[PDB]
Amino acid sequence: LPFQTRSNPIPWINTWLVSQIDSEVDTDDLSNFQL
Amino acid sequence: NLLVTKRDGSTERINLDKIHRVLDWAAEGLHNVSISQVELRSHIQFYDGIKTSDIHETIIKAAADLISRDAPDYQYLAARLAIFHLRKKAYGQFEPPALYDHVVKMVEMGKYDNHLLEDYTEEEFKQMDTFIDHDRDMTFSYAAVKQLEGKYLVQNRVTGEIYESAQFLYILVAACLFSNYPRETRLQYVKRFYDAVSTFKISLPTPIMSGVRTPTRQFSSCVLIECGDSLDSINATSSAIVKYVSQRAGIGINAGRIRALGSPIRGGEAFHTGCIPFYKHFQTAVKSCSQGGVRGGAATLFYPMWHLEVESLLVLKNNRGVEGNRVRHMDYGVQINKLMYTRLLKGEDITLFSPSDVPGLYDAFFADQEEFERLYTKYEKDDSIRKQRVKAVELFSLMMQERASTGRIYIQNVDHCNTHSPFDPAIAPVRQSNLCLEIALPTKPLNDVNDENGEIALCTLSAFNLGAINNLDELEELAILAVRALDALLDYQDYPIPAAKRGAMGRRTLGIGVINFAYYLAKHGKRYSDGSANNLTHKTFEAIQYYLLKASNELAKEQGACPWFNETTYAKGILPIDTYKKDLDTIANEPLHYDWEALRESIKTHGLRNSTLSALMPSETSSQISNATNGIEPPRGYVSIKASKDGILRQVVPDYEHLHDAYELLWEMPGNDGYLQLVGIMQKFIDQSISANTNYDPSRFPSGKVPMQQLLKDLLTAYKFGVKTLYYQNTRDG
Ligand SMILES: Nc1ncnc2c1ncn2[C@H]1C[C@H](O)[C@@H](COP(=O)(O)OP(=O)(O)OP(=O)(O)O)O1
Ligand SMILES: Nc1ncnc2c1ncn2[C@H]1C[C@H](O)[C@@H](COP(=O)(O)OP(=O)(O)OP(=O)(O)O)O1
Ligand SMILES: Nc1ncnc2c1ncn2[C@H]1C[C@H](O)[C@@H](COP(=O)(O)OP(=O)(O)OP(=O)(O)O)O1
Ligand SMILES: O=c1ccn([C@@H]2O[C@H](COP(=O)(O)OP(=O)(O)O)[C@@H](O)[C@H]2O)c(=O)[nH]1
Ligand SMILES: [Mg+2]
Ligand SMILES: [Mg+2]
């Protein structure tokens, strides 16, 4: 490589070169709780 | 051969080299930017006589919209372009004038407060001009600069004329707050606090940013008004709202005391029209004005879950009804306690009462949980009292359903707000919250606009940038600078409502939060969902509270504790490490690293300058100044789209290039358990509350629908770990 690494200075050129609620509730499962 | 119109009105031949020079300067040192891209994306339409100021605004927009993951440095190119444009708008040149020459002209124009010239001499102003580093404007991001020119920099809200720059805002906010300090240490603090906020160690809220140096002195973000069950209180509440929304404030209204529709008035001389007609009156009070011309007026209204009209109030934002029983443009917070949750778990009913038919049931609902259960079960059996039973499963389903569709039906667990608070529930209970559900302070209803007996809760805010600290011990120095600057602000500002000044001077409540928490977790390689940040969150927020309490404790030694300190639980020698919810012991085992017992003794002896100190606010706008991730929330994406008065803004996560893997984005989270656990751990130390968000992705669920089972299980999970309040419910769509 003869030049320094560089990002593409014209990136725009690449466009030219390549182509509800599940309302069901289970109280027993919720009852298995301790606040 | 065509001509451009310069800033001074003169014209010269169009020279594209002028544009190349500007952009090459703004792209200097940046990686992966393109001068050519900015010019071509500008689509700049030249015409003979085109204004040069409009030309520059075009290339700022173009460079701003090029902010991407592949080119994150455009956030700095567009910022440098925007600072340049803002220098010209206020000064006509690049170099800002002297600090004295500027303040002189501005106080002369009535744009600055008069006291700046009286409290500081020209020799003192020139000394602070040496503190200023105007090159720190080159460390902002584009989102920060747009919020500066859009909301914070002193400007004309009819002309659009920009008057100041960024570094003047900082040094004068520091000057005004410590202006009343002793001269042997005044400029010592003014330099230190300027350095803290200009290098993004401390974040200042919107009213402090846009206010502190202006004639009109109101800088409290949150105003909490309690409404009694009388017309005089309703009239007083309405007047206070109008005054405070007009002065940069977000209101929290407690209209739960208003009796239910159909209740007798004067023993039957009148039929009570209901709560909703008064709620409509509160809405027009909020919407009548703007928040000092910065943003629009907003308010959140609170009522107990057991109110008789609760089924009508839960749907007030629901568009599926007539305007008569809809109050859409206000948010609401449903107040719940342990007994209400118990009725759900046991599949039992919930009885609804009007607060006027249950003596002492309302006050017990907050201050005395045992007294509430006694009166509640008692009045449930009384057949003379007007009541209405609803299945707890149905009432909760309606609430969470309205919470899910609007996103603005909030929850406040009133028992946690009093059993684990800095206040004695028997002396000064917490009966409400604020617009964003992070403030919890005592309130007493008013009987007149100038009623001396009522109390309106004010809270002044600021935030610690967790991404800017390298050691948790930096918070000791930061808490001193933050608490001192905010406590001085309480004496510096004005109060349009006497009842509010009473609370602000009596308790001197502050609300200091955090920003850049998601970037903080990324730096430590932790995440929200997995629970790997539990012990880190515990260690972090212990230091935040400890150094905050310590700072206000030393400030109490220096200038005396707040007048109403005897009403706090800190006065009884009680610390947050005592009253926290014990379920946190099963999700975090991090030990306390600081000497809390010595602090407990010193607080018992010298007191606190401030009744509260910590509260975790969203910092929706203010966090963008330091390009931080807002509050404790995880960013929506690596490049987030945020709102602005002009249009849309692109904000890159801090340190994206080195940490894009360490971040856990909002919708990359499986559920809410990991986040709510972190909130519960934070709440162990925070005096007030946290603007906790719940998030749900419908695509993550079978049939693409979010179950009510999960909404309720998360709500119970939040209560199990002592979460005081619940803010937004974000629902994905993409
Ligand atoms: N002759 C020109 N033709 C076209 N564009 C120009 C010209 N000179 C400057 N510009 C562009 C470059 C900048 O990005 C943008 C703002 O320039 P700026 O220097 O702030 O305006 P100005 O030169 O009229 O004011 P000032 O007198 O403060 O320099 O205008
Ligand atoms: N040290 C620096 N600080 C800030 N800007 C710089 C610096 N060095 C170079 N620049 C850039 C910023 C401007 O785009 C340009 C000079 O600005 P400006 O005075 O507007 O010149 P100009 O090209 O508009 O000519 P004129 O203003 O005389 O029409 O150089
Ligand atoms: N004429 C009215 N029409 C509709 N609602 C009213 C009327 N007067 C009062 N209200 C509402 C507002 C209050 O929430 C509640 C009681 O108002 P308030 O001014 O306390 O009444 P009061 O003190 O004259 O008699 P009481 O309090 O015994 O009913 O009823
Ligand atoms: O649109 C808004 C957003 C916030 N706030 C107030 O600001 C406080 C904290 O909000 P945040 O810190 O997110 O706002 P910022 O000060 O960062 O703009 C809230 O409790 C509100 O009282 C407001 O009045 N209007
Ligand atoms: Mg020029
Ligand atoms: Mg009355």
**What Å distances lie between residue B620 and B208, B214, B245, CA to CA?**
15, 23, 18
CA distance linking residue B285 with residue B327, whole number of Å: 13
CA distance linking residue B515 with residue B628, whole number of Å: 6
Annotated catalytic sites of B, by residue? 434, 436, 438
Length, in residues, of chain B: 734
Q: Which of B349, B716, B394, B340 is nearest to A29 (CA)?
A: B716
Question: Dmax of chain A from CA atoms?
Answer: 74
Element (H, E) at B641: strand B639-643
CA distance linking residue B697 with residue B704, whole number of Å: 9
Domain boundaries, chain B: 1-200+637-663, 201-636+664-734
Length, in residues, of chain A: 35
**Phi and psi torsions of B654, nearest 5°:** -65, 135
Kind of pairing between the strands at B648-652 and B639-643: antiparallel
Helix, strand, coil distribution of chain B in percent, nearest 5: 45, 15, 40
Phi-psi region of B192 (alpha: psi -120 to 50; beta: other; left: phi over 0): alpha
Q: Is B709 within 8 Å of A24 when comparing Cβ atoms? A: yes
B-chain residues within 8 Å CB-CB of A7?
31-32
**Regarding the domain delimited by B201-636+664-734, which CATH topology (the fold level of the hierarchy) does it fall under?**
Anaerobic Ribonucleotide-triphosphate Reductase Large Chain (3.20.70)
CA distance linking residue B417 with residue B440, whole number of Å: 7
Tell me how many degrees the CA angle B723-B727-B732 measures, rounded to the nearest 5. Answer: 120
Distance of CA B489 to the CA centre of its chain: 17
Q: Is B706 within 8 Å of A21 when comparing Cβ atoms? A: yes
Phi-psi region of B262 (alpha: psi -120 to 50; beta: other; left: phi over 0): left
Task: Please write down the HEC assignment for all residues of B328-393.
Answer: CCCEEEEEECHHHHHHHHCCCEEEEECHHHCCCHHHHHHHCHHHHHHHHHHHHHCCCCCEEEEEHH
Measured from the CB, is residue B6 less than 6 Å from ligand 1? yes
Which ligand is nearest the CA of B4, by number? 1
CA distance linking residue B602 with residue B572, whole number of Å: 12
Q: Ligand 2 centre from B22 Cα, in Å?
A: 7
**Are B300 and B294 spatial neighbours (Cβ–Cβ below 8 Å)?**
no
CA distance linking residue B555 with residue B597, whole number of Å: 19
Outline where DSSP puts E strands in B222-266. 222-226, 250-254, 264-265
Which DSSP symbol is given to B152? I
CA distance linking residue B413 with residue B334, whole number of Å: 9
Binding annotation of B for GDP: 206, 434, 438, 620-622
Which residue has 């010193």 as its token pair? B602
Q: Is A4 an 8 Å CB contact of chain B?
A: no
Q: How was this structure determined?
A: X-ray
Binding annotation of B: 6, 12-18, 52, 88, 206, 229-231, 259, 266, 434, 438, 620-622
Q: Is A22 within 8 Å of B347 when comparing Cβ atoms? A: no
Element (H, E) at B476: helix B474-492
